[PDB]
Design an enzyme around this catalytic site. Structure first.
Site, PDB file in Angstrom:
ATOM      1  CB  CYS A  10      -1.038  -0.046   1.134  1.00 48.31           C
ATOM      2  SG  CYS A  10      -0.460   0.150   2.821  1.00 48.31           S
ATOM      3  NE  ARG A  22      -4.944   1.002   1.430  1.00 47.21           N
ATOM      4  CZ  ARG A  22      -4.819   1.754   0.337  1.00 47.21           C
ATOM      5  NH1 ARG A  22      -5.720   1.669  -0.630  1.00 47.21           N
ATOM      6  NH2 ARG A  22      -3.805   2.597   0.220  1.00 47.21           N
ATOM      7  CG  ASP A  51      -5.988   5.151   2.325  1.00 53.36           C
ATOM      8  OD1 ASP A  51      -5.988   4.684   3.492  1.00 53.36           O
ATOM      9  OD2 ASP A  51      -5.171   6.025   1.933  1.00 53.36           O
TER      10      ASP A  51
END
Lengths: 150, 149
Positions: free
Chosen positions: B8, B14, B121
């Site tokens: 990420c 994540r 996100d």
């Protein structure tokens, strides 16, 4: 001068935001009112949340911030009005407010002519979305593990 | 064995979540696969986000966590597959991945037979909500200032 206290659950996001914003608008109108903030619950934290402070900066406020503090009994006497961010906050203060001062308690949004009556907790919203991310990632992970054995 | 990297932007939310979930599913089947995670952007942080980890605990995963790290060129050679959580991550990876290794790049959700191809996100959503929280507070503040004067 006048004394105003603003209260959310942890004194980490909502009430420190209101303190900074109120202080600024008071200074623009040159009113003799001072403002502080506090939380109903003892947190371990010293300073408010960084993401609260950055949102204030994005809107042109300068976040010079007091340490986190929990509400005290003297707050109900010393302060002229005390504003709660949501109903749960208003209940916990009423729960512990001596009857001589309970008329000083009100929801923060009570004078804004708007549908919203409570400012919702950004932290609970945050947690909901992280939990949603976990589930989507889990679904992805299972598929990758399948593809790998092929 | 097989070596997998998930990526990420900051390696804070994540991708470490994916590393931990993948590691659990790999060990559940005792497969010979290693998994790591990394970020495209160098931040100063040492460990991933507290609420990423707590969200893992909420679903019964035990978050044992590697330190945050930035992706390197050795990552493109050492790893067999490299997964980007979203298109922005895949774009930043393609920018710096040598052309010999671009076939190792894919979206994390590429095998999930779903509409969603990107993991959104949580940090950007969170930031959006604090901004709208501030606006609601500001409008409240303006009304309070009026009644006092």
């Amino acid at each position: 001068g006048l004394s105003v206290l603003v209260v959310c659950t942890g004194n980490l996001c909502r009430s420190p935001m209101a303190e900074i914003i109120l202080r600024d608008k008071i200074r623009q109108k040159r009113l003799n009112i001072q403002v502080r903030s506090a939380g109903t619950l003892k947190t371990g934290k010293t300073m408010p949340d960084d993401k609260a402070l950055q949102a204030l900066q994005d809107y042109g406020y300068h976040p010079m911030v007091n340490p986190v503090q929990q509400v005290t009994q003297q707050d109900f006497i010393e302060h002229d009005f005390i504003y709660a961010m949501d109903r749960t906050n208003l209940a916990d203060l009423l729960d512990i407010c001596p009857a001589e001062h309970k008329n000083k308690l009100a929801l923060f949004l009570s004078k804004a002519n708007r549908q919203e009556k409570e400012v919702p907790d950004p932290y609970r919203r945050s947690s909901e979305f992280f939990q949603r991310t976990a589930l989507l990632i889990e679904s992805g992970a299972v598929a990758l593990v399948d593809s790998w054995q092929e």
